[PDB]
Amino acid sequence: MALIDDFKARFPNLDGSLVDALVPVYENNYSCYYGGSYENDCDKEAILLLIAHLVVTDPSYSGDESSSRAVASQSVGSVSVSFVAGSTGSDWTNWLNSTRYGQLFLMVTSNNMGPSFA
Amino acid sequence: MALIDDFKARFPNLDGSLVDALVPVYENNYSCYYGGSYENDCDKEAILLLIAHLVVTDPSYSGDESSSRAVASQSVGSVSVSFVAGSTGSDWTNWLNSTRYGQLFLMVTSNNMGPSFA
Amino acid sequence: ASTFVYKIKGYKQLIQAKKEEDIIKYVSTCEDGRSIYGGLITDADDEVSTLT
Amino acid sequence: ASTFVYKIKGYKQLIQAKKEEDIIKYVSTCEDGRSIYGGLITDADDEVSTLT
Amino acid sequence: DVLSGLINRRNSMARNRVSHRYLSDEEMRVMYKAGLMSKIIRLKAGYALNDTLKFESTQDQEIYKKRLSKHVKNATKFMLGFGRGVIVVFKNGDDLSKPLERGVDPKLLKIRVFSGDIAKGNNPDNDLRSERYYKPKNYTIKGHTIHWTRVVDFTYYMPSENELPDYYYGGMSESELIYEQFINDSVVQRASGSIIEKASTFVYKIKGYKQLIQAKKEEDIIKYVSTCEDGRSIYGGLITDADDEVSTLTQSLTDLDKVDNVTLRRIAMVTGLGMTVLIGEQASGLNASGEKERQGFQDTI
Amino acid sequence: QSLTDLDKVDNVTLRRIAMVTGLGMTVLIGEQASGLNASGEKERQGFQDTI
Amino acid sequence: WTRVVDFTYYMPSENELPDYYYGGMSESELIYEQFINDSVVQRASGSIIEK
Amino acid sequence: DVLSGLINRRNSMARNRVSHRYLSDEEMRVMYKAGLMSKIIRLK
Amino acid sequence: DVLSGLINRRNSMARNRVSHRYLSDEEMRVMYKAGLMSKIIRLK
Numbered sequence: 001m002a003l004i005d006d007f008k009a010r011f012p013n014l015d016g017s018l019v020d021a022l023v024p025v026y027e028n029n030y031s032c033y034y035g036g037s038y039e040n041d042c043d044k045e046a047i048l049l050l051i052a053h054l055v056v057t058d059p060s061y062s063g064d065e066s067s068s069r070a071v072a073s074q075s076v077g078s079v080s081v082s083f084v085a086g087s088t089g090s091d092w093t094n095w096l097n098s099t100r101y102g103q104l105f106l107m108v109t110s111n112n113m114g115p116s117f118a
Numbered sequence: 119m120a121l122i123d124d125f126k127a128r129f130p131n132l133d134g135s136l137v138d139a140l141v142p143v144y145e146n147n148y149s150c151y152y153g154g155s156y157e158n159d160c161d162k163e164a165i166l167l168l169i170a171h172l173v174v175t176d177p178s179y180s181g182d183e184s185s186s187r188a189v190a191s192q193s194v195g196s197v198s199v200s201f202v203a204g205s206t207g208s209d210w211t212n213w214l215n216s217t218r219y220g221q222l223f224l225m226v227t228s229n230n231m232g233p234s235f236a
Numbered sequence: 237a238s239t240f241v242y243k244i245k246g247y248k249q250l251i252q253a254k255k256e257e258d259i260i261k262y263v264s265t266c267e268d269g270r271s272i273y274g275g276l277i278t279d280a281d282d283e284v285s286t287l288t
Numbered sequence: 289a290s291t292f293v294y295k296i297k298g299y300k301q302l303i304q305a306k307k308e309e310d311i312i313k314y315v316s317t318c319e320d321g322r323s324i325y326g327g328l329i330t331d332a333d334d335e336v337s338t339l340t
Numbered sequence: 341d342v343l344s345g346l347i348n349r350r351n352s353m354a355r356n357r358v359s360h361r362y363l364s365d366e367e368m369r370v371m372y373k374a375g376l377m378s379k380i381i382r383l384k385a386g387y388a389l390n391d392t393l394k395f396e397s398t399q400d401q402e403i404y405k406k407r408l409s410k411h412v413k414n415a416t417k418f419m420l421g422f423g424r425g426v427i428v429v430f431k432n433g434d435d436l437s438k439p440l441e442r443g444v445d446p447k448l449l450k451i452r453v454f455s456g457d458i459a460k461g462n463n464p465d466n467d468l469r470s471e472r473y474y475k476p477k478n479y480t481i482k483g484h485t486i487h488w489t490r491v492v493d494f495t496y497y498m499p500s501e502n503e504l505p506d507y508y509y510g511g512m513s514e515s516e517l518i519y520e521q522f523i524n525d526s527v528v529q530r531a532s533g534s535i536i537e538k539a540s541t542f543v544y545k546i547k548g549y550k551q552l553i554q555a556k557k558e559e560d561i562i563k564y565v566s567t568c569e570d571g572r573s574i575y576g577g578l579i580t581d582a583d584d585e586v587s588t589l590t591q592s593l594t595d596l597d598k599v600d601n602v603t604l605r606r607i608a609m610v611t612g613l614g615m616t617v618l619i620g621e622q623a624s625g626l627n628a629s630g631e632k633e634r635q636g637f638q639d640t641i
Numbered sequence: 642q643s644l645t646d647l648d649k650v651d652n653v654t655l656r657r658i659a660m661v662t663g664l665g666m667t668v669l670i671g672e673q674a675s676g677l678n679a680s681g682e683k684e685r686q687g688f689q690d691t692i
Numbered sequence: 693w694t695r696v697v698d699f700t701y702y703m704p705s706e707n708e709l710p711d712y713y714y715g716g717m718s719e720s721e722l723i724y725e726q727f728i729n730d731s732v733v734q735r736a737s738g739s740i741i742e743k
Numbered sequence: 744d745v746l747s748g749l750i751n752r753r754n755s756m757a758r759n760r761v762s763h764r765y766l767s768d769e770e771m772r773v774m775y776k777a778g779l780m781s782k783i784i785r786l787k
Numbered sequence: 788d789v790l791s792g793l794i795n796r797r798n799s800m801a802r803n804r805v806s807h808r809y810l811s812d813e814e815m816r817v818m819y820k821a822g823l824m825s826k827i828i829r830l831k
Contacts, residue, residue: 010143013178035557042147056183070185075193084190084203086212092551093209100177103185103213108150109554110210111307113298114314115330116553117562118322118541153307210301227304229255231246232262233278234303235312236270236291240291240339245300262303269748272531272538272591275292275319275336277312279300284293286339289531290591292538297550314553319753321792324642324736324743327542327569329561331550332583336543338591373704375661375722382702386690414703422705457705526725526744529657532650533729533755536736537794540642542743569797573742592646600653620659620666623676623687633686644740647733654730661722725756731788732755738799759790764800773807 001038003027003051010048011101018061026054034109046108053102070097119156121145121169128166129219136179144172152227164226171220188215238288240270245281290340292322297333362506363519365422369457371515371522372421380514380611385417387634387641408451415453415494423511424456425494428486438487454481461493461509473501476509517610525603532596540590542572547583612640663691 004023011019034050036043055061057068069091073082087093096102122141129137152168154161173179175186187209191200205211214220242263250256270276278284294315302308322328330336342348349355371377389412395402402409411427418425430439431449439445462479465471477488496511498504515522544565552558572578580586608615614626614636627633659666665677665687678684701716703709720727745751752758774780789795796802818824 011178013181032557034555035559042150045147078195080191080193081189082191084188084201084206084212084215086187086207086209087550088207090548090551092548092555097185097187097209100175100183100185103187103209106209106554107213108147109556110298111150111153111302111305111310112556113296113302113550113553114311115294115296115318115328115334116314116558117565118318118326118328150307152305153309208298208301210298210305224304227306228246229250229253230258230306231250231300231303232244232259233242233266233276233282233284234262234308235315236266236274236276269750270291271748271750272290272292272535272593273319273750273753274748275294275315275322277294277296277299277315280295280297280333280335281300282295284291284295284337284339289535289593289595292541292589292591321794322541323537323792323794324540324542324644324740325569325794325797326792327544327565327572327586329544329546329549329565332545332547332585333550334545336541336545336587336589338589340591340594369705369707373708373717373721375725376657378702378722379661379663383691390690455705457707523744529653529725529729530744530754530756532653533725533732534753534758536644536647536650536733537755537758539644539646539736539740542642588642590642590645592644593649596646596649596653618656618660620656620664620669622659622663622691623665623667623684626690627686627688628690629686634690642740642743644736647737647740651730651733651737654726654733658723658726658730661726662719728759728761728788729755731761732759735788735798735800739797739802742799742802758792759788759794762789766805770805773805776807777805 003038003047006044007048007051010045011052014052014056015061019055022055022058022060023051026051026058030054034105036109042108046105049101049105049108053096053099053105056099056101068098069094121156121165124162125166125169128163129170132170132174133179137173140173140176140178141169144169144176148172152223154227160226164223167219167223167226171214171217171223174217174219186216187212238286240267241285241287242278243283243285245279290338292319293337293339294330295335295337297331361516361519363513363516365457367519368422368513368515371513372455374522374526376522376525377421377514377518380607380613381417381420383613383617384420384514384611384641385413387637388416389413390628392641411451411453412494418453418455419494419496419511420514422456423496423507423513423516424459424461425511426452426454426456426459426481427492427494428452428454428481428490429492430486430490434484435490436485436487438489441489456511456513458482464509473504474498474509479509514611518607521603521607521610525600525607528596528600528603531593532600535591535593535596539592540588542569543587543589544580545585545587547581612637663688 004020004027007019007023030047030051033054034046036046038044038047057064059065070093071083072085074080093106096105122138122145125137125141148165148169151172152164154164156162156165175182177183188211189201190203192198211224214223244259247256247259250259266276276284296311299308299311302311318328328336342353372381389409393402393404393409395404408427415425415427429445429449429451431445439449459481460479461476463477464473464475465477466473471477471488475488476493478485479488479491480486481491493510496513497517498511499507546561549558549561552561568578578586604618605615607613608618616622616624616636617626625633626636630638655669656666658664659669667673667675667687668677676684677687681689698715701718702722703716704712745756775784789800819828
């Protein structure tokens with residue numbers, strides 16, 4: 001399969017070598033972040049979005065050893081915003097709302113929700 | 119079908135090449151963001167609005183790697199507003215309220231609401 | 237003797253925008269089968285109640 | 289006489305995005321077996337209730 | 341009892357007018373098979389014919405009994421089941437036309453019995469001359485046809501003449517009398533069985549299962565619950581979380597007995613059998629011997 | 642958790658079986674001593690009509 | 693035919709007699725609504741106490 | 744008694760078909776020892 | 788009475804098979820002393 005190649009096209013803006021030396025890492029273990037299958041074409045989009053998330057917020061990429069979760073109110077100099085709250089109290093959603101790519105990941109997959117096994 | 123062409127007319131203001139190199143991507147997988155059909159003419163408007171949302175907030179377009187969700191109170195310099203709250207605690211609504219095109223998407227489709235399968 | 241009630245958020249607006257055709261249709265299909273055997277599906281902001 | 293109710297958060301949106309096919313399927317499979325023997329699995333924000 | 345408001349319109353008086361269902365022949369067939377009315381038809385027919393026949397012909401005592409008194413019982417069952425029981429008699433030679441009663445057939449004849457399903461009535465003379473609008477003049481039992489005086493008709497409770505053809509000239513199945521009932525009781529009963537399996541459902545309101553399904557990596561939590569449910573008993577306490585919440589929901593037919601009561605009361609009425617028989621406490625006062633117990637409903641019979 | 646109406650449904654189901662089979666309710670419950678017996682004086686009369 | 697003696701129970705209408713293959717009706721067919729229901733009542737009855 | 748919904752499928756009618764256990768000989772042995780049926784067998 | 792779910796497995800049918808205890812002779816001794824069966828044995 002061509003995950004490294006399919007990834008490069010779907011996100012032409014990340015970087016070159018930096019994404020080339022990290023995707024072969026998260027490719028190894030995405031299968032136990034998101035239990036999807038790389039067929040079912042738009043599930044493939046979900047995998048790419050997650051892999052993209054795992055590479056944009058990997059410290060070997062942005063040099064950000066600290067964590068990375070969603071911002072509820074950011075203020076810079078003389079410009080300030082307060083994002084309307086949503087689905088608070090869940091690190092998983094907060095972690096992926098840290099970057100745009102993760103935000104899509106909740107939400108290509110936001111339709112799989114439901115109860116099970118009663 | 120002419121999604122790329124129907125899109126260009128309905129939103130003559132986005133960009134040229136930038137929308138030309140991204141719509142052929144989100145065209146692939148909009149069908150599992152919004153389960154509508156491209157017939158039922160004003161449902162077609164819903165698809166375009168969503169596709170437009172997915173392209174305006176795609177990082178390859180605005181260069182905004184961070185997420186993009188609705189602002190509840192923004193302050194810039196000496197001008198400040200606080201938007202009256204609405205339908206808080208839902209990332210889906212917040213995500214699409216980030217841009218105008220998404221705001222329409224909730225709302226061309228806000229009439230489909232109801233319970234089912236009792 | 238007892239009336240099922242779909243206190244539904246937003247039905248304020250749907251009637252007000254007079255595009256309330258679909259929500260009635262879904263409820264009509266939903267009521268067409270509301271039984272011991274199939275559980276309702278409604279929303280957190282929704283509230284189903286019964287009045288006697 | 290009694291209707292099981294899945295007050296489910298986000299089903300607001302799933303119908304609204306008309307991609308509500310999967311949640312109905314899971315509930316249909318879930319109701320296909322809801323018994324004394326298998327406990328429901330739902331969410332903190334979820335709320336299962338029963339109306340008589 | 342009507343004034344000063346809109347009460348006039350919404351009461352049970354004008355909010356609904358009366359109408360009666362005409363259950364089809366195929367539906368009439370099904371109820372004959374169904375267990376409930378199967379006893380209804382069997383009970384009422386037996387209570388009518390079981391050693392209750394005064395014979396004024398002691399000589400050749402009850403030659404009726406050993407030959408066709410059993411044919412009639414299946415036929416009078418077909419009365420109640422379909423509204424039309426039929427006995428067909430003809431000589432050794434099949435004939436469309438009338439039996440030669442110039443010399444009345446001296447037991448050189450065969451016997452048939454037919455349900456109202458395959459049997460039916462066809463031809464009424466609208467004139468008042470021979471047999472009024474009631475009595476047919478010739479009707480088909482099958483592909484064949486049988487003369488009127490050939491055939492003996494077990495006709496049940498008949499409606500008004502203006503609509504007699506809709507029952508095809510004779511009787512009314514008890515089903516048509518209790519179609520309101522058998523459907524209702526069946527509804528009572530089918531729901532009765534399925535309520536217990538859902539009488540109480542254990543619920544794992546689990547925080548984060550929002551996401552686990554959403555990330556479709558929800559395989560492990562189902563496995564743990566399946567192992568956990570495989571042993572949830574009085575003997576081992578659950579282990580869950582502060583943010584978790586285990587609860588139990590009960591659903592049950594709150595008025596199962598009341599509705600099952602109302603439905604059974606009416607069937608006792610319309611069929612004429614007592615309430616005790618439908619409940620099944622036949623020992624009390626509804627029995628065979630007519631001293632006092634068969635007197636319980638002998639008037640209906 | 643417990644079957645809140647176990648007796649009611651078990652009641653309804655047993656009532657019908659007494660009907661359709663023709664045997665009394667007492668036999669299904671198992672209180673055969675009361676009035677459903679062998680000797681036909683009065684007890685077998687309980688359902689002898691069905692037989 | 694004249695060799696064999698047939699113990700035929702309650703028979704349905706002729707239009708469907710072949711579906712029972714020419715004779716009678718098991719009590720089960722009369723109470724299949726019942727035996728399933730009671731069994732459901734009872735199987736659930738045993739397992740409710742342990743939970 | 745079946746129409747206009749999915750009631751047709753989830754009722755006790757079709758949700759389960761009938762089947763009977765064949766308890767093994769060794770299990771047949773154990774109940775002969777067990778107190779309850781011991782009186783059953785003895786009484787009858 | 789078994790279909791369409793995992794009801795088949797968790798009911799009292801298959802969740803437990805039958806077995807009978809063999810109380811030892813020393814335990815058999817103790818109950819002979821115990822008050823309850825002491826009347827049982829004496830009465831019968």
